[PDB]
Design an enzyme around this catalytic site. Structure first.
Site, PDB file in Angstrom:
ATOM      1  N   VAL A  85      -9.313 -30.818 -52.125  1.00 54.99           N
ATOM      2  CA  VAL A  85      -9.177 -31.086 -53.555  1.00 54.99           C
ATOM      3  C   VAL A  85      -7.707 -31.117 -53.979  1.00 54.99           C
ATOM      4  N   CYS A  86      -7.367 -32.052 -54.859  1.00 55.26           N
ATOM      5  CA  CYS A  86      -6.007 -32.165 -55.371  1.00 55.26           C
ATOM      6  C   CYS A  86      -5.935 -31.548 -56.764  1.00 55.26           C
ATOM      7  CB  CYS A  86      -5.565 -33.630 -55.408  1.00 55.26           C
ATOM      8  SG  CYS A  86      -3.779 -33.885 -55.320  1.00 55.26           S
ATOM      9  N   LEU A  87      -6.015 -30.221 -56.810  1.00 55.79           N
ATOM     10  CA  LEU A  87      -6.043 -29.482 -58.066  1.00 55.79           C
ATOM     11  C   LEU A  87      -4.644 -29.275 -58.628  1.00 55.79           C
TER      12      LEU A  87
END
Lengths: 147, 606
Positions: A85-87
């Site tokens: 995930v690219c949080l």
């Protein structure tokens, strides 16, 4: 050194053990390691009503962010098939050592209720959400219910 | 076996004979050697137990090493003799002049009543004086008096301006080098220190110690205390700021003035530098200067924290320091911090946590040495770590605050931060830098200064609010590496310079290969969502170069990559979020060969 990350989580847990998150349940972690947690992200807003995240804390924590990773197949334009995930919150540009976990999740959760093609990790269905919406909601409730 | 009428030659004989055949239960006639002139002969090593010498004249004699237990030297002379390492246990030396070198000379249980060590000496090891009767004896400063026995005091006050009275005996000051300072240096003239003499009399003589102490002061010139002579002023604090000295007013009031200027000068001179370990007297005395001057808490902040860290830990004064601290953190410059989500006990109490068993709680709060509203929060353990170059840290182990507002430390220049706000961590950091060779390697690769000094000054931080993904920025970069890369592999001509330069020249295939992985790792982070590239678009020229380094490493020694599942996924990512990969490669290096990684990769990215 690395006994200090374990030193904070402990505090962070009891706080959850009492109040409790209402959109994140079933956090299981053995008292030995503690550098990693398992759990379930159970969303209430469709099309994901009808996921086993595995946030992995680093040793130098909390001077590095946690790595929330999915141990379940997901159909999101922000989640790679490897679970990645690219949080923003756990990103090295917005990271303040003062961030809790009940905040890093409330962020990763509210992301699925209103995704973003601005920082997409898959061009597989990025434009898919863009042009035809009903095609990403009639093709989501399916992939969600198949795995 | 003696008579003083046999020459100095006839006498030796009888003695050396004596030492040999040692009956033990000799007769009074045999052991009798009294009044005999023994001026000048050697008697070293002999066994002269129980021998009589009452009246003898041993001036200028060398009786070292030799045994003398149970001897009787009542009324003997010793002008410039040598008695080192001797043995005198139980001997009788009442009313007898001793003017000699008594290195480690054992007087245990001896009779020294009315003896006078006028101007003796010892060079490193003091005489021994347990159970020695010194009642009425004249001892010289530096003599350790522990276990010894001085008389109840005959005259409370003392007359002659040359002698100081401690109990039953006198502390002569004739040969004092004409300066009362020499006698007050615990640190360097420990053997001349009268502060040592006094402070080691059995507790039984406390009142005397104070009586004497009070009497020592009237001897001290304050106009001769001008010159800094730090080990004397220091020395004063440690000796006279301890029971029973604390209670006596006439003393204490004399110290404040002499201590304030000193400890002030100290706190100043050692600010933003490591704090010297100090005795209880000294340490306490420092706390009082911080109690009296609430200002230094800020003017010498670092200098102040360390003091309080030693105080807090110091048995016998722990609560007094813990107090002083909680009067500091009331500062309008500190309080904001104190009420922080995770500081101290975390109870949100806004008070420091003193019950820890690994000093890893976040109590200590430092303030910037400059006016820029900056203050960090840390843990004794962490504060320590970041205090030594060699440690495997990254100097980000804390909570930075600008005007009481938490911060993303990473967007900060570590140098400019440690150099102007918290100069302590600066020496340990700017040495861990010197050691790091990344900046030296990046000096060979690139050669365009307008750009070179643009990647070096960004490797001293993590996130950079400076981008280079623009259609004109990639126009600056591509210009640089075009002549070096080869599509997505290492342009052979480069691999010539690389494995040839001072960098890898003469380096085992094991270590040579190792290195390449790191440098490859470096440029990944450059094009990371964290640095130059955005998380959406990333500079393809750098990712390109990287790929070559991770490759040309492989052909040097694959026993460095270990698995090949990894190697394939490394490329399966760098070519087709540069962020996830960076740590992915940083963490494997700190694991597979840490020693080479702490040397060839930006300290501030560790």
């Amino acid at each position: 050194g690395s006994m200090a990350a374990s030193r904070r989580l402990m505090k962070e847990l009891e706080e959850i053990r009492k109040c409790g998150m209402k959109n994140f349940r079933n956090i299981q972690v053995d008292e030995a390691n503690l550098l990693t947690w398992q759990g379930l992200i159970v969303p209430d807003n469709p099309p994901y009503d009808k996921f086993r995240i595995e946030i992995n804390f680093p040793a130098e924590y909390p001077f590095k962010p946690p790595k929330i990773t999915f141990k379940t197949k997901i159909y999101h334009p922000n989640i790679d098939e490897k679970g990645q995930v690219c949080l923003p919150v756990i990103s090295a540009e917005n990271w303040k050592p003062a961030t809790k976990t009940d905040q890093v999740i409330q962020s990763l959760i509210a992301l699925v209720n209103d995704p973003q093609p601005e920082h997409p990790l898959r061009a597989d269905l990025a434009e898919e959400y863009s042009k035809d919406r009903k095609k990403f909601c009639k093709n989501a409730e399916e992939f969600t219910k198949k795995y | 076996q003696g008579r003083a009428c046999l020459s100095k030659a006839e006498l030796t004989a009888d003695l050396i004979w004596l030492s040999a055949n040692r009956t033990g239960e000799e007769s009074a006639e045999e052991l009798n050697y009294s009044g005999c002139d023994l001026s000048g002969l050697s008697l070293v090593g002999l066994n002269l137990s129980s021998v009589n010498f009452s009246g003898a004249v041993l001036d200028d004699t060398d009786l070292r090493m030799s045994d003398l237990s149970q001897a009787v030297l009542e009324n003997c002379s010793f002008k410039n003799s040598i008695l080192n390492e001797c043995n005198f246990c139980y001997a009788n030396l009442s009313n007898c002049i001793i003017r000699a070198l008594f290195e480690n000379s054992n007087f245990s249980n001896s009779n020294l009543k009315n003896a006078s060590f006028k101007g003796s000496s010892y060079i490193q090891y003091p005489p021994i004086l347990n159970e020695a009767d010194l009642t009425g004896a004249i001892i010289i400063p530096g003599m350790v008096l522990s276990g010894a026995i001085l008389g109840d005091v005959k005259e409370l006050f003392s007359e002659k301006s040359n002698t100081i009275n401690l109990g039953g005996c006198y502390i002569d000051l004739s040969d004092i080098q004409e300066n009362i300072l020499s006698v007050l240096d615990n640190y360097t003239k420990s053997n001349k220190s009268i502060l040592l003499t006094m402070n080691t009399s059995d507790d039984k003589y406390n009142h005397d110690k104070v009586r004497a102490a009070e009497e020592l002061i009237k001897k001290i010139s304050l106009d001769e205390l001008a010159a800094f002579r730090p080990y004397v002023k220091m020395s004063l604090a440690d000796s006279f700021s301890i029971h029973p000295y604390l209670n006596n007013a006439n003393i204490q009031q004399w110290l404040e003035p002499i201590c304030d200027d000193f400890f002030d000068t100290i706190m100043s001179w050692f600010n933003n530098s490591i704090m010297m370990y100090m005795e209880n007297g000294s340490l306490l005395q420092a706390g009082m200067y911080f109690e009296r001057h609430p200002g230094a808490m800020v003017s010498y902040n670092s200098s102040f924290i360390q003091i309080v860290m030693n105080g807090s830990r110091r048995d016998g004064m722990q609560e007094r320091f813990r107090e002083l601290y909680e009067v500091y953190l009331k500062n309008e410059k500190v309080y904001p911090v104190t009420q922080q989500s995770d500081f101290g006990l975390c109870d949100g109490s806004g008070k420091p946590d003193w019950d820890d068993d690994s000093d890893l709680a976040y109590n200590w709060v430092l303030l910037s040495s400059q006016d820029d509203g900056m203050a960090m929060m840390c843990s004794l353990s962490h504060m320590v770590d970041m205090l030594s170059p060699n440690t495997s840290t990254n100097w980000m182990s804390f909570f930075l605050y600008k005007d009481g507002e938490v911060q993303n430390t990473f967007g900060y220049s570590l140098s400019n931060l440690f150099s102007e706000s918290f100069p302590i961590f600066s020496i340990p950091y700017h040495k861990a830098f010197s050691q790091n060779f990344v900046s030296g390697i990046l000096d060979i690769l690139i050669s365009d200064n307008e750009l070179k000094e643009r990647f070096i000054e960004a490797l001293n931080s993590n996130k950079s609010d400076y981008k280079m993904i623009a259609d004109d920025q990639q126009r600056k970069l591509a210009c640089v590496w075009n002549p070096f890369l080869d599509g997505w592999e290492l342009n052979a001509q480069h691999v010539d310079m690389i494995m040839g330069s001072h960098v890898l020249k003469d380096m085992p295939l094991r270590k040579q290969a190792e290195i390449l992985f790191c440098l490859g790792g470096v440029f990944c982070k450059y094009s990371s969502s964290d640095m130059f590239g955005t998380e959406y678009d990333s500079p393809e020229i750098l990712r390109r170069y990287a790929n070559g380094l991770i490759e040309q490493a492989y052909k040097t020694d694959p026993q460095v990559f270990g698995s090949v599942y990894y190697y394939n996924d490394i490329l399966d990512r760098l070519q087709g979020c540069t962020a996830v990969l960076t740590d992915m490669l940083t963490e494997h290096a700190k694991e597979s060969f840490p020693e080479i990684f702490s040397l060839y990769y930006p300290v501030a990215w560790r």
